[PDB]
Amino acid sequence: MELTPDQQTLLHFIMDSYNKQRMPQEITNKILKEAFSAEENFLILTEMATNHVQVLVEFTKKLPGFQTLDHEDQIALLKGSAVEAMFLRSAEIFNKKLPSGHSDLLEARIRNSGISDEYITPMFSFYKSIGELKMTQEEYALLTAIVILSPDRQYIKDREAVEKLQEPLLDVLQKLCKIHQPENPQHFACLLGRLTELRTFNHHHAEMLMSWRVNDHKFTPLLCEIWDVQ
């Protein structure tokens, strides 16, 4: 039922590594402060995404057993999860409670950032689906670790080694779901199901960025490695 001492240790360790990311308030304060042009917002996105990948690699390296995996499998897991982790972190930030009217202005500002309408609808639909789960910071952190340690990624040579690292995180998350929402026994399955919806952002991420309403789509060398661009 309850978390074991080893599970508690693992949870706080994951939380500590997860909290090293750029603060949600920092991000929403900039978007809410003033409106930017589609060109300015595109540059804000590439800098945000570059910093996100850098911190994501540091978070990934701290996941227990990650460093014992095959080097080519390590690359495949990072490359296979970076885009999903960015959208999951964006969903977390979007769902943080703000003063009255602020989330509406934040949504409207993102909606007019330069991204095409056809990508707007699936994006905000995912954010609001995530918002309905009323996830805790611990649930976001564990779900991010579970996304990264997905044994089903393309080019993974040793799936069983990845499974062994993901399974204890799924067990911890399942216990947290039973504790945070005892009235909702579907909560864990819901959380896992939203991970399937998360995977849809991979197929169209390159088009989402290339169709941004700007004349030049400049990306950093690191983003070029992780995103299918340039």
Partner: peptide, 13 residues
């Protein structure tokens, strides 16, 4: 090489 910067960030420290 493919994913040269990622391989670097993974193998450093």
């Amino acid at each position: 090489k493919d994913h040269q910067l990622l391989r670097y960030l993974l193998d450093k420290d």
